Paper text:
pmcWDR5, a well-established core scaffolding protein found in histone methyltransferase complexes MLL1-4 and SET1A/B, was initially characterized as an epigenetic histone “writer” to recognize histone H3 lysine 4 (H3K4) and is essential for H3K4 di- and tri-methylation (H3K4me2 and H3K4me3) to activate gene transcription. Two separate and non-overlapping sites located on opposite surfaces of [name] mediate most of its interactions with binding partners: an arginine-bearing cavity located on the surface known as the [name]-interacting ([name]) site, and a shallow cleft on the opposite side referred to as the [name]-binding (WBM) site. In mice, methyl-CpG binding domain 3 isoform C ([name]) interacts specifically with the histone H3 binding protein [name] ([name]) and forms the [name]-[name]/Norde complex. The residues Val31-Cys334 of [name] are visible and consist of seven WD40 repeats that form a seven-bladed β-propeller structure.
Several structures of [name] in complex with a series of mutated [name] peptides were determined to comprehend the underlying molecular basis of the [name] B site recognition. In comparison to the wild-type [name], the dissociation constants were approximately 4-fold and 6.8-fold higher when Phe47 was mutated to alanine and histidine, respectively. In addition, a new water molecule is introduced into the vicinity of [name] Cys261, leading to the formation of a hydrogen bond network that closely resembles the one observed in the [name]-SET1B structure. Thus, these data indicated that [name] Phe47 is crucial for the opening and recognition of the [name] B site. We further confirmed that Phe47 is important for [name] binding through the substitution of phenylalanine with alanine or histidine.
Author numbering:
A (entry chain C): 40 to 48
B (entry chain A): 31 to 334
């Protein structure tokens, strides 16, 4: 994936 | 006066979520980056697929054009940035030195520098010609969500999940200003206004704010959309009426009147979070792009 397409964990 | 943006094209081809779309300064192209590790180039006016640019080993969160429309820079989970020649598709330089995901990037107007922000909490300034890192700013205490040069390149604005926006002197790397606001919710996006006097900042409390960073005063707020989770791009639309444009986590594009802050249009048709929007430099055209359940780019056109 890509960081921008994920939520903060 | 309200716009009448209508869907004209849907651009398929990315195999994972889009991360961002940007129009080339000369208006000819749209560049898209995706979690699928690829950049794609499209005709800005007809959506015609033009080419695929590859080489990053992990997904890409951001992509930006040089002022002459000839180069791109991309920011990837593989901890590098890449500088690409658009006409040939070749990777001209790989920018190494971040220790975690690179999240955001931008050229300065001169296009001899690149600014980047990363999960490693740093902002880096890179020499375009050599690909070398000129400066590492300990900019923030959490991931850097956005970085943008001002209109003459003397300033950089950065935003972070630490709740801060910071203005930096490009030449020295020194911090000129820290903007804090309320209880400092994560700042998910920032950019300068076209005249350089303001910054538009998104926070993960469903809010956009127009700031005179020069005085530290919030001039406008834009609300009614959903933004609690993702770093969604916002824009100034200046080709017709003066709008603010943003994606939203309810799958819509929102358009606000800049002065009155009223919503003037909501663009429906994406089937997932609209992670990214861009405004065409000369025509009333919006590009929008969405996450995993959609993976498409849409081009919308308006009479004003």
């Amino acid at each position: 994936g890509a960081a921008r397409c994920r939520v903060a964990s | 006066v309200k716009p009448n943006y209508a869907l004209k094209f849907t651009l398929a081809g990315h195999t994972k979520a889009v991360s961002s779309v940007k129009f080339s300064p000369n208006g000819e192209w749209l560049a898209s980056s995706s979690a699928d590790k690829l950049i794609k180039i499209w005709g800005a006016y007809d959506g015609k697929f033009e080419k695929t640019i590859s080489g990053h080993k992990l997904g890409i969160s951001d992509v930006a054009w040089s002022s002459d429309s000839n180069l791109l820079v991309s920011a990837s989970d593989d901890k590098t940035l890449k500088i690409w020649d658009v006409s040939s598709g070749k990777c001209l330089k790989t920018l190494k030195g971040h220790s975690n995901y690179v999240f955001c990037c931008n050229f300065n107007p001169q296009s001899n520098l690149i600014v980047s922000g990363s999960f490693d909490e740093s902002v880096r300034i890179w020499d375009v010609k050599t690909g070398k890192c000129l400066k590492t700013l300990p900019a923030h205490s959490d991931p850097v969500s956005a970085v943008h040069f001002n209109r003459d390149g003397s300033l950089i604005v950065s935003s972070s999940y630490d709740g801060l926006c910071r203005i930096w002197d490009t030449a020295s790397g020194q911090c000129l200003k820290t903007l804090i606001d309320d209880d400092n919710p994560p700042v998910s996006f920032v950019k300068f206004s076209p005249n350089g006097k303001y910054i538009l900042a998104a926070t993960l409390d469903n809010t956009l704010k127009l700031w005179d960073y020069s005085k530290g005063k919030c001039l406008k707020t834009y609300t009614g959309h959903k933004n609690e989770k993702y770093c969604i791009f916002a824009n100034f639309s200046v080709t017709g009426g003066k709008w603010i444009v943003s994606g939203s986590e309810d799958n819509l594009v929102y358009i606000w009147n800049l002065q009155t802050k009223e919503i003037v249009q909501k663009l429906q048709g994406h089937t997932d979070v609209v992670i990214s929007t861009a405004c065409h430099p000369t025509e009333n055209i919006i590009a929008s792009a969405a996450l995993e359940n959609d993976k498409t780019i849409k081009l919308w056109k308006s009479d004003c």
